[PDB]
Amino acid sequence: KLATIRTAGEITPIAGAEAIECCHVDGWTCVIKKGEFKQGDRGVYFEIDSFIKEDNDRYPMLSKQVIDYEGQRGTRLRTARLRGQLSQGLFLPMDRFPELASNQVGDDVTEILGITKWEPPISTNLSGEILGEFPTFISKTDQERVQNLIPQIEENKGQKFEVTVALDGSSMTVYRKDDHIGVCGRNWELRETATNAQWHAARRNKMIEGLQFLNRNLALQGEIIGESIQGNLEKLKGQDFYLFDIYDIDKAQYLTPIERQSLVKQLNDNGFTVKHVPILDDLELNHTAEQILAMADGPSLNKNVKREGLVFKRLDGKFSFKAISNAYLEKHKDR
């Protein structure tokens, strides 16, 4: 949902820059031209990671940022700082889009506006030979951002969440379905070869044997991190897998934080040395999105580096979200 119709929230002036002002859009804050919106006005909000194909009539404000990306000319939206003011996304009034004049607030207009997703380059050894599609009987590893979850954050006041450090690597799934055990990246099941990093990590921590021991239809989902993976923020030597979720294939449901933690303990008790993403204290939710984003900055798995952020998974395993550190996004312009 890169481009959606949203509502201008609080509009606050930026001291010393009378030509612009700060617009809150859900949990995001975004610099607009002074007077472009009033609180309550609707517009199209384009999230960071939007890639907006070149168009100086509709998008002249992006003109000097046009780059070549996957053979297209256009602009990547990313976190910026303007006059000391944090700015994320692009927010344009509805009258700039006459073809949306009878759409509704909340509508996803990504496809109609031709917006595509920008992503960092995938790391060398994490692209292997493809064996097949990512299994349709396993959920992929996505997380919604807290900035997009204002009402849900409200409903969940008092609920308890497992808090884990978000690790900056590549998503990796190792699973068992009856007589088949497979290793996947984010979007594909991979063939075992000598150079495949994901298979190597699954063999080295004995997690294939661990799945054979547990004898259940489970998908172990985690982050492979380390050297030549997204710049190796943790300064690891070699590479390693860090579990964050277990999907129950037979029940088509994630395991709860407590079910997952005890299964990981049994694996390690039996010699299967599967590591887990860092687990912090459980959080009783009673927070605004702004407050959640403030906890996002802090120590990573390597305590001497600042983390990508935090993932919150409710104790029933049925509601999860991610809070990315904005200091992290400011420091790492390649993501």
φ/ψ (deg, to 5) at 248: -90, 105
Q: CA 323 to CA 309: how far, in whole Å?
A: 6
Q: Which of residues 278-307 bind ligand ATP (CB under 6 A)?
A: none
User: In terms of CB distance, is 85 or 116 closer to ligand ATP?
Assistant: 116
User: In terms of CB distance, is 83 or 140 closer to ligand ATP?
Assistant: 140
Q: CA 311 to CA 332: how far, in whole Å?
A: 19
Binding mask 150-189 for ligand ATP (x = CB under 6 A): --------------x-xx---x------------------
Please, what is the minimum distance in Å from the beta carbon of residue 324 to Mn ion? 8
From the list Mn ion, ligand ATP, none, partner contacted by residue 311 (C-beta under 5 to 8 A by kind): ligand ATP
From the list Mn ion, ligand ATP, none, partner contacted by residue 167 (C-beta under 5 to 8 A by kind): ligand ATP
Q: Which residues pair with 125 in a beta bridge?
A: none
From the list ligand ATP, Mn ion, none, partner contacted by residue 164 (C-beta under 5 to 8 A by kind): ligand ATP
From the list ligand ATP, Mn ion, none, partner contacted by residue 220 (C-beta under 5 to 8 A by kind): none
Q: CA 178 to CA 181: how far, in whole Å?
A: 8
Please, what is the minimum distance in Å from the beta carbon of residue 110 to ligand ATP? 13
Element (H, E) at 284: strand 283-284
φ/ψ (deg, to 5) at 153: -60, -40
Q: With binding defined as CB under 6 A, does residue 249 bind ligand ATP?
A: no
Q: With binding defined as CB under 5 A, does residue 334 bind Mn ion?
A: no
Please, what is the minimum distance in Å from the beta carbon of residue 143 to ligand ATP? 4
Contact, 195 vs 217, CB < 8 A? Answer: no
User: In terms of CB distance, is 5 or 311 closer to ligand ATP?
Assistant: 311
Q: With binding defined as CB under 6 A, does residue 49 bind ligand ATP?
A: yes
Contact, 289 vs 147, CB < 8 A? Answer: yes
Binding mask 124-163 for Mn ion (x = CB under 5 A): ------------------x---------------------
Contact, 219 vs 242, CB < 8 A? Answer: no
Contact, 67 vs 75, CB < 8 A? Answer: yes
Please, what is the minimum distance in Å from the beta carbon of residue 164 to ligand ATP? 4
User: In terms of CB distance, is 8 or 74 closer to ligand ATP?
Assistant: 74
User: In terms of CB distance, is 91 or 244 closer to Mn ion?
Assistant: 244
From the list ligand ATP, Mn ion, none, partner contacted by residue 171 (C-beta under 5 to 8 A by kind): ligand ATP
From the list Mn ion, ligand ATP, none, partner contacted by residue 277 (C-beta under 5 to 8 A by kind): ligand ATP
Per DSSP, the residues of 56-123 read TTT-GGGGGG-EEETTEEEEE---EEETTEEE-SEEEEGGG-GGGTT--TT-B-TTTTT-EE--PPPP
Residues 6 or more apart whose CB falls under 8 angstroms from that of 43 comprise 5, 6, 8, 37, 91, 92, 93, 94
Q: Which of residues 114-133 bind ligand ATP (CB under 6 A)?
A: 117
Binding mask 32-51 for Mn ion (x = CB under 5 A): -----------------x--
Alpha carbon 192 to its chain's center: 27
Q: CA 333 to CA 57: how far, in whole Å?
A: 27
Q: Which residues pair with 260 in a beta bridge?
A: none
State the residues that interact with Mn ion by CB under 5 A: 49, 142
Where along the sequence are the contacts to ligand ATP (CB under 6 A)? 49, 117, 141-143, 164, 166-167, 171, 223, 244, 277, 311, 322
